[PDB]
Design a protein around this ligand. Structure first.
Ligand SMILES: CC(=O)N[C@@H]1[C@@H](O)[C@H](O[C@@H]2O[C@H](CO)[C@H](O)[C@H](O)[C@H]2O)[C@@H](CO)O[C@H]1O
Ligand SMILES: [Br-]
Ligand SMILES: [Br-]
Ligand SMILES: [Cl-]
Length: 138
């Protein structure tokens, strides 16, 4: 098992065709999960499943620039379940991050931070047991 929060360095940043795969299991009674693709202190792409936001499950995506969060992009389709194993795959495409969970497409997030080669770390945190975090080029 890997320790959470986990930092996965992305050498030389990301680039189209790079696929990041995370495998883990949601804790029972989980409250949140977060993936933070970072460019230094900025968060190019924050992916944040929330298990109980005003008694609703929602995935919130955003970007943090100079310590300020921008406009949130929300997705009500919620494929995660407390206590169950999951697979998140994030594929970098030219204009967006494309996310699939358990092999089903979930959402896309348009690139706000354009210096892809400077998004050099991925932080994985939240209420999960982390099994694997890796990348490959497809
Ligand atoms: C309904 C609403 O406006 N909610 C927002 C919260 O989402 C927001 O929380 C922060 O959200 C960012 C992502 O945008 C990130 O997940 C932070 O961890 C989280 O604290 C909150 C504070 O910015 O404002 C509320 O208005
Ligand atoms: Br922004
Ligand atoms: Br954590
Ligand atoms: Cl930029």
């Amino acid at each position: 098992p890997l320790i959470v929060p986990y930092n996965l360095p992305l050498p030389g940043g990301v680039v189209p065709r790079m696929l990041i795969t995370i495998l883990g299991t949601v804790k029972p009674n989980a409250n949140r999960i977060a993936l933070d693709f970072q460019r230094g202190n900025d968060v190019a792409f924050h992916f944040n499943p929330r298990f109980n936001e005003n008694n609703r499950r929602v995935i919130v995506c955003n970007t943090k620039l100079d310590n300020n969060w921008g406009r949130e992009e929300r997705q009500s389709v919620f494929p995660f379940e407390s206590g169950k194993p999951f697979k998140i795959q994030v594929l970098v495409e030219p204009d967006h991050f494309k996310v699939a969970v358990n092999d089903a497409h979930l959402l896309q997030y348009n690139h706000r931070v354009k210096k892809l080669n400077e998004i050099s770390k991925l932080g994985i945190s939240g209420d999960i047991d982390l099994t694997s975090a890796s990348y490959t080029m497809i």
